[PDB]
Amino acid sequence: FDYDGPLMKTEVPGPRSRELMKQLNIIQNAEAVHFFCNYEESRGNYLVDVDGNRMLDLYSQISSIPIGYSHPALVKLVQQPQNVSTFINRPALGILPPENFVEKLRESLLSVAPKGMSQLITMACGSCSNENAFKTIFMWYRSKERGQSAFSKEELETCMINQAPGCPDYSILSFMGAFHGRTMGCLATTHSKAIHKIDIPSFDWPIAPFPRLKYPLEEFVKENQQEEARCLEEVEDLIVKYRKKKKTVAGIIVEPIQSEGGDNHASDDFFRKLRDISRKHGCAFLVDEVQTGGGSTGKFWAHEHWGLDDPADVMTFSKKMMTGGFFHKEEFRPNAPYRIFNTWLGDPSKNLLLAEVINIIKREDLLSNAAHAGKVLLTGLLDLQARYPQFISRVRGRGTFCSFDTPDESIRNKLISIARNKGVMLGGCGDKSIRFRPTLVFRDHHAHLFLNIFSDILADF
Amino acid sequence: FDYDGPLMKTEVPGPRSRELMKQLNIIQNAEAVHFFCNYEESRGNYLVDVDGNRMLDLYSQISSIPIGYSHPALVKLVQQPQNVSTFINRPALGILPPENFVEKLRESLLSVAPKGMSQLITMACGSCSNENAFKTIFMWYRSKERGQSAFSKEELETCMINQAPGCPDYSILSFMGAFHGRTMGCLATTHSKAIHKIDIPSFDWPIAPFPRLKYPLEEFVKENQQEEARCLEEVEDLIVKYRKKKKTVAGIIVEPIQSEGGDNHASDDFFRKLRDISRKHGCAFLVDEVQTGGGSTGKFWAHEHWGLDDPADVMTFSKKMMTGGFFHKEEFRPNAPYRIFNTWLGDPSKNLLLAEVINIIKREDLLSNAAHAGKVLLTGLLDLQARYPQFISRVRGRGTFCSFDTPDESIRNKLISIARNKGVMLGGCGDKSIRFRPTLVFRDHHAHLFLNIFSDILADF
Numbered sequence: 001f002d003y004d005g006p007l008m009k010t011e012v013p014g015p016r017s018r019e020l021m022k023q024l025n026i027i028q029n030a031e032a033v034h035f036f037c038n039y040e041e042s043r044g045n046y047l048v049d050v051d052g053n054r055m056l057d058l059y060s061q062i063s064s065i066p067i068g069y070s071h072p073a074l075v076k077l078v079q080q081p082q083n084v085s086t087f088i089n090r091p092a093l094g095i096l097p098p099e100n101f102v103e104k105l106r107e108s109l110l111s112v113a114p115k116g117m118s119q120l121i122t123m124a125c126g127s128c129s130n131e132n133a134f135k136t137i138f139m140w141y142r143s144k145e146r147g148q149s150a151f152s153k154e155e156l157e158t159c160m161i162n163q164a165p166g167c168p169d170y171s172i173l174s175f176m177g178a179f180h181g182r183t184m185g186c187l188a189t190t191h192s193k194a195i196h197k198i199d200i201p202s203f204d205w206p207i208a209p210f211p212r213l214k215y216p217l218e219e220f221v222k223e224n225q226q227e228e229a230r231c232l233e234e235v236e237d238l239i240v241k242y243r244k245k246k247k248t249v250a251g252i253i254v255e256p257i258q259s260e261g262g263d264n265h266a267s268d269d270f271f272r273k274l275r276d277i278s279r280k281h282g283c284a285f286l287v288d289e290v291q292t293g294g295g296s297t298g299k300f301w302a303h304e305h306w307g308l309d310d311p312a313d314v315m316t317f318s319k320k321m322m323t324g325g326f327f328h329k330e331e332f333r334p335n336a337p338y339r340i341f342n343t344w345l346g347d348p349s350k351n352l353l354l355a356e357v358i359n360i361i362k363r364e365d366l367l368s369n370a371a372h373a374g375k376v377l378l379t380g381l382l383d384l385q386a387r388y389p390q391f392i393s394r395v396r397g398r399g400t401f402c403s404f405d406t407p408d409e410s411i412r413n414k415l416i417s418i419a420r421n422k423g424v425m426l427g428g429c430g431d432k433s434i435r436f437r438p439t440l441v442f443r444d445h446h447a448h449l450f451l452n453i454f455s456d457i458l459a460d461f
Numbered sequence: 462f463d464y465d466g467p468l469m470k471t472e473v474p475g476p477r478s479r480e481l482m483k484q485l486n487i488i489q490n491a492e493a494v495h496f497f498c499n500y501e502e503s504r505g506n507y508l509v510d511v512d513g514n515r516m517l518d519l520y521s522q523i524s525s526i527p528i529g530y531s532h533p534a535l536v537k538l539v540q541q542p543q544n545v546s547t548f549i550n551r552p553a554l555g556i557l558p559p560e561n562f563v564e565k566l567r568e569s570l571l572s573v574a575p576k577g578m579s580q581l582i583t584m585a586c587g588s589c590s591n592e593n594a595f596k597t598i599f600m601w602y603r604s605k606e607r608g609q610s611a612f613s614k615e616e617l618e619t620c621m622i623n624q625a626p627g628c629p630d631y632s633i634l635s636f637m638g639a640f641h642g643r644t645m646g647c648l649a650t651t652h653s654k655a656i657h658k659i660d661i662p663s664f665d666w667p668i669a670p671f672p673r674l675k676y677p678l679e680e681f682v683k684e685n686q687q688e689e690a691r692c693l694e695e696v697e698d699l700i701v702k703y704r705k706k707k708k709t710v711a712g713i714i715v716e717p718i719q720s721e722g723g724d725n726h727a728s729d730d731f732f733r734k735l736r737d738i739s740r741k742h743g744c745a746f747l748v749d750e751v752q753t754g755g756g757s758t759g760k761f762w763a764h765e766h767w768g769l770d771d772p773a774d775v776m777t778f779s780k781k782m783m784t785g786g787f788f789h790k791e792e793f794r795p796n797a798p799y800r801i802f803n804t805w806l807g808d809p810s811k812n813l814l815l816a817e818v819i820n821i822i823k824r825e826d827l828l829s830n831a832a833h834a835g836k837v838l839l840t841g842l843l844d845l846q847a848r849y850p851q852f853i854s855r856v857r858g859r860g861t862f863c864s865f866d867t868p869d870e871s872i873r874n875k876l877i878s879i880a881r882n883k884g885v886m887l888g889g890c891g892d893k894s895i896r897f898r899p900t901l902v903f904r905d906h907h908a909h910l911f912l913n914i915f916s917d918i919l920a921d922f
């Protein structure tokens with residue numbers, strides 16, 4: 001199910017949205033609110049607002065809608081009398097799972113498991129996913145050192161009062177421009193934007209540079225080779241430095257593509273080497289596919305492009321997957337219960353939906369579509385870049401996971417603003433980048449539709 | 462709608478459950494799993510397992526089911542065609558709220574707002590509620606000190622790389638026996654059980670004693686008075702100590718009743734004084750009603766019993782409320798967007814359900830019922846304590862939020878185990894305590910159903 005195209009009635013946000021924003025602003029700081037929606041009248045790639053505007057949505061709730069709005073298969077799920085319980089009887093999954101819990105997992109997440117990762121734990125969101133992955137990593141690392149032996153009394157005591165040796169001074173290494181969530185643990189590994197971090201206590205963990213590729217790629221092979229190597233060298237030193245600071249690096253976390261930090265890419269070769277470095281130093285290698293995961297880059301998990309049989313030790317996801325969680329290697333399996341745990345540990349209602357989404361993705365060949373429609377999109381982008389260098393630069397992407405840079409944040413914001421009133425929703429990232437996150441039912445005819453609209457926006461800009 | 466009583470077919474876990482546990486254990490450490498459920502056939506106070514056992518459930522998914530299983534009002538919600546969208550179109554609430562977002566909030570959470578707290582932010586679970594409350598507190602404290610001065614360049618820079626002054630070395634003060642979640646931030650303020658904390662890096666934040674009362678309370682008035690005062694004095698010193706350590710205490714977090722740490726109570730006078738201490742030192746006073754919130758103690762929020770007009774600055778909730786989040790004072794309102802934020806920030810599907818739950822709680826007078834049924838329960842407990850001092854001690858509670866202690870963890874575990882096979886589900890907390898967390902449709906005769914099963918148990922034990 002899809003509308004034919006955008007149809008704007010008003011400027012966005014419209015008056016009905018601005019009234020609503022007025023109201024919500026009493027209860028809370030509502031400034032981030034773009035506009036108020038009518039999800040009931042949304043279908044496929046089109047988001048409909050409360051003022052009747054129908055926009056072509058290439059932002060997809062910040063990349064969290066897998067197969068578009070009001071998908072008929074999902075409707076059918078909710079319509080089943082047999083599914084009511086799932087929607088109104090939320091279990092404490094850790095202790096009282098439902099009967100269908102493993103089957104439905106087999107129908108969903110387990111069917112797209114990363115290579116080498118037999119283990120799977122579920123979480124409600126992306127930040128608890130990464131947090132618990134951090135914990136899993138720390139637990140595994142003390143487990144290396146302690147061996148298959150008992151907990152010490154000193155440890156058992158100190159841990160209750162936030163002290164070593166119970167609470168080790170271990171670290172997780174992260175990259176500049178990164179974003180892994182905003183709870184106090186994730187937040188230490190996030191390095192996106194000062195407003196996200198400022199005033200919040202943090203952890204003294206190593207921060208490494210992430211490759212900054214110069215475009216176009218054809219023209220910069222050597223430079224881009226050298227940049228990556230420099231970064232890789234900087235990671236290694238960092239690990240060493242911290243081993244010596246006695247703040248051992250237990251794990252490394254990285255995004256296949258840095259998203260919030262400004263859609264930053266690196267070579268598969270880069271990631272392949274980073275994976276070895278991790279291994280070489282006994283660092284658990286944590287790949288955060290929370291935003292890149294879900295097929296939009298042409299493969300279910302972005303890391304898949306790297307072509308490795310042992311791509312990672314832990315992989316976190318959320319967003320598109322409807323539920324959060326993380327896959328991991330058998331060897332990372334917590335040694336005892338009640339260590340990695342929480343009340344809800346996900347939500348069977350999401351798994352229900354997820355199982356169907358995955359099915360759709362497979363039956364409708366959406367991974368491939370993403371690749372194809374992505375190419376069309378990226379091609380058009382390149383064409384616009386040629387025609388409008390004064391505005392567009394560094395056109396990049398994989399699958400539909402595309403973006404470009406504008407000269408500054410004001411223009412960046414203006415273009416988004418214009419496009420939105422013209423019937424297209426784009427996202428921004430970093431200071432001055434515009435980003436695309438189309439749902440997986442984004443066909444290449446929407447890629448044209450966007451290109452033909454935005455083309456005319458540029459001639460008039 | 463509710464069954465007549467328990468009917469056990471098998472031991473628990475039964476064979477069908479043990480097979481399922483076998484399977485789930487391949488993918489993850491499944492040891493915490495009690496048994497596998499059939500939520501479809503579950504009904505009001507009765508949880509039905511996959512082996513056909515029907516148990517009287519006084520644990521309520523660790524206190525997260527407000528009005529029992531398969532509640533007909535909740536069924537009706539899910540059956541509405543108009544609600545389908547809510548269940549399958551999950552918004553990034555921070556930026557693209559649905560049209561009904563404020564109305565439904567008015568129908569739900571805002572209608573039970575704590576005194577003095579105009580502000581409300583939503584979260585997906587209790588762990589992120591507290592994390593973000595911590596952040597809100599840190600942000601607010603910075604503002605007090607920096608008055609109308611803006612962000613500094615030093616701060617803006619250091620914050621991106623996990624350093625002061627950008628990242629201040631502030632602290633949140635917590636109590637022994639506490640439990641506030643397990644993400645790395647919450648976890649620092651948790652002091653429940655070594656297995657929960659061990660091997661995880663933490664924060665050097667002050668930890669204060671939580672009063673430990675002697676029973677029966679009639680006979681220990683002075684001692685219990687003195688214990689509380691000692692604790693209060695210890696809090697104050699701690700704050701001072703840390704002000705001097707230049708690890709300023711920005712906030713204090715406490716549970717109205719410590720749950721996971723072993724259902725630890727204190728006087729309303731105690732909490733009233735603790736609230737003043739906080740105020741006196743410019744500490745934000747954070748009350749965590751994640752488990753105590755939701756009416757089970759006879760009032761919607763446990764802190765209400767304290768009778769204060771300004772009970773707190775921030776209050777977190779989750780579990781029974783279906784959604785997470787925290788209320789707070791206008792003055793704690795983030796100064797700018799994108800500081801307290803995340804992708805989903807809750808889930809309108811939960812709010813939908815919550816609004817109805819609240820309505821039920823009011824129409825059916827469930828707060829009062831809780832109080833009444835609680836009394837019956839607590840009375841019976843006291844009677845058993847008299848008859849079986851060799852097993853039962855320190856019977857306590859408020860509303861249905863009851864518990865008692867057993868001589869040791871083995872007996873504690875045995876009694877729970879026996880009761881479960883006899884058709885009652887109890888929870889444990891601390892080393893040797895048994896705890897009650899009945900849903901809000903638990904009535905006096907359900908208390909008598911339990912008291913009778915458990916009397917017979919204690920006799921031939």
Ligand SMILES: */C(C)=C(/CCC(=O)O)NCc1c(COP(=O)(O)O)cnc(C)c1O
Binds near residue numbers: 062259
């Ligand atoms: C994804 C849409 C976002 C929103 C940006 C923001 O929160 O300001 N970032 C999420 C993110 C996380 C945390 O996930 P969640 O807790 O918001 O669900 C972790 N890892 C990655 C790669 C992210 O994109």
Ligand SMILES: */C(C)=C(/CCC(=O)O)NCc1c(COP(=O)(O)O)cnc(C)c1O
Binds near residue numbers: 587641643721752779
């Ligand atoms: C409540 C059922 C629990 C489960 C115990 C556990 O996780 O080991 N405690 C939760 C809780 C939190 C954290 O919320 P959530 O992440 O579990 O949803 C925070 N504060 C209190 C008082 C809690 O009880």
Ligand code: FES
Binds near residue numbers: 587590
């Ligand atoms: S911190 Fe993940 S749902 Fe709460």
